[PDB]
Design a protein around this ligand. Structure first.
Ligand SMILES: [Cl-]
Ligand SMILES: [Cl-]
Ligand SMILES: [Cl-]
Ligand SMILES: [Cl-]
Lengths: 234, 234, 234, 131
């Protein structure tokens, strides 16, 4: 009923620091829509196997592995840049951050080395990370050395977004809500289509539009055609 | 057919200072689409009552009232931050700004204390502010004290936008054109649906994604199911 | 399996500087969807007239001509602004840049003087700049003097975007993929509509939302109903 | 020149694509009499694709010192039921396994078989544990 004034205190101080650092990066935005009908089908048929192993299976393992596969072809997106963007460090480890909000807001644990993990290992690893993170009990090692971030705004709502890049990373994407929409198929009839939006932000100092673009189509094509993923997994 | 160079004079000076000031804010964008069918119909039936009362009823009063109702639960979106985001002031009054362009550039009057005003009063205050705005007769009190801003780009066209937060506020939303699109209902059939897109921008130093998202959901449910609002209004 | 640090060098340093000089610009984002169904048809008809004159014809020359017509109406969008935004230079020529990525990064050649060129001469100029651009032989004069920029992200993929304004310009558009979507027609029946998304960013210091939105609308009606262009050309 | 059984090394660590590559080569090699000792030795397990000429079921001969072999027949389109009770075009391929009954028992070939088949009938399940 009156104005209350307060200090930005405790943990909230870190978000201020991070997002201010983020103003030094000219964000380029590139968004698209991805047809997840196959993937949803795919997932429904994998839930029984993962449940039988003690693991809930979201879409995220899929998204994460596809980005990993994507970053093999476009390593620049898994890089870091220095104080005034004079030097680029290309990172070997695909340590993808899963953006989370807690009772304390922004916290970004990462799955280490997705490049050598199975979809199933990543499920397992996300499951550990939520258990811990909602328990307020996420460790330092889980929190450092991220190379690239995904953020599932769609777990709550949303179509497109403009996510903020997390220094020293050069990219992030946001995934919206999976939604049934009327869409045409090869036959030209109106199908139910399981449609999701993705928004990528990138540091346009060193990552051009074609690279985000091309990365995005590859990532996307792994998800629309999940067999495409089968070809290069070991 | 030659290049003309001109001073930015007078009133145009202030947009320069307002927008440059917004460079210090790290903008997180979050977007959605809102199904306004029930609201379009709802407006048709109220239109004759408000015309009888002498008011023109647009969608804004509803957006505004749904925003305020939303800000009761996410009061941090109706707040301010200081020079370096050290201290947040949570504002009790919902003084929601409405952006306009005038011959003289950007002007943003606000409706005071929406938290204690009915949709109909809001309608009235809008017409008052619109008349005045376009007559160049807005008072100082009409302009000062804004706590949150809506921007109806949809009066002209557009789907999504990236609106610019107005210091010292922490959030702004842009509303796009109402468009009839084909969408599924519960029975899985193709419908006429009135769809509006909304774009929020938020100061990500103190507002996190969940906050902006859950707010958007809540706001969004008040409008897609108008009668939800009716529960807590006195 | 190893990290690698390399410097940003030579022909890459330039993208660093450009994109960093864009951080001084408060970017306003406005987006829309265009119905390109009549243009696709129209393009089909002209294709065997261009092939017979040596010219590949895409959509870009239409986009260029429709932007130039827009700019005659809204000359402030083909304008420049000084060191701290205190003078506007309104620019006669519509030198419109086409944003390209090379095996060399970001290159932005422009078509000089679109306001005095036919769609055909525009097509001719685009072809030329593509032969030269993809062979890394663009001259200095093709490179300098741009007043306004369009960027065809959609030759690769994408829906909406946040393009980064190139100083000293004040605006830029990005065009998405032309995608066949189900849409209602006049009679309220479900049609195959060729839908493209467009995304403009504009220097909000001197450009208000009204002008970006009205410009868009004009641009968009030239493309949705191409006869309108006919009316005024010589 | 008769029976020649080269082998793909270390399948457990190679991708499908990698394996298609190594077969392409093994074939160019074999069908010119130019497989090396290394291509030829060290086999742990054998498949036999009789279906490239024709056939349904078979009784292939385990190659000592290995303990199992499988033959794959032709892929024919056959009428089969789906979940819903309707008559569809199904591609049915027969497999025949022979196993050294001294140390391999019936359940093992069975379950193995089921699994292999499982991965093939539902090619997506292969996704889960590949990396
Ligand atoms: Cl920017
Ligand atoms: Cl930012
Ligand atoms: Cl900004
Ligand atoms: Cl749509």
């Amino acid at each position: 009923g009156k104005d209350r004034t307060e200090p930005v205190k405790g943990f909230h101080k870190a978000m201020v620091k991070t997002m201010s650092a983020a103003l030094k990066i000219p964000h380029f935005g590139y968004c698209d829509e991805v047809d997840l009908t196959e993937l949803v089908k795919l997932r429904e048929e994998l839930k029984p196997i993962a449940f039988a192993r003690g693991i809930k299976l979201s879409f995220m393992p899929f998204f994460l592995k596809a980005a990993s596969l994507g970053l093999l072809q476009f390593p620049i997106l898994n890089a870091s840049v220095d104080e005034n963007c004079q030097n680029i460090t290309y990172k070997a480890s695909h340590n993808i951050g899963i953006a989370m909000d807690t009772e304390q807001g922004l916290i970004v644990p990462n799955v280490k080395n997705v490049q050598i993990r199975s979809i199933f290992e990543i499920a397992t690893e996300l499951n550990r990370l939520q258990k811990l993170g909602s328990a307020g009990q996420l460790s330092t090692n889980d929190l450092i050395g991220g190379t690239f971030t995904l953020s599932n705004i769609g777990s709550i709502g949303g179509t497109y977004a403009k996510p903020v890049i997390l220094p020293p990373e050069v990219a992030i994407g946001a995934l919206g809500t999976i939604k049934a929409l009327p869409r045409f198929n090869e036959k030209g009839e109106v199908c139910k289509a399981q449609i999701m939006n993705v928004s990528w932000s990138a540091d346009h100092r060193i990552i051009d539009g074609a690279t985000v673009s091309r990365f995005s189509n590859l990532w996307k094509s792994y998800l629309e055609n999940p067999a495409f993923m089968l070809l290069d997994l070991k």
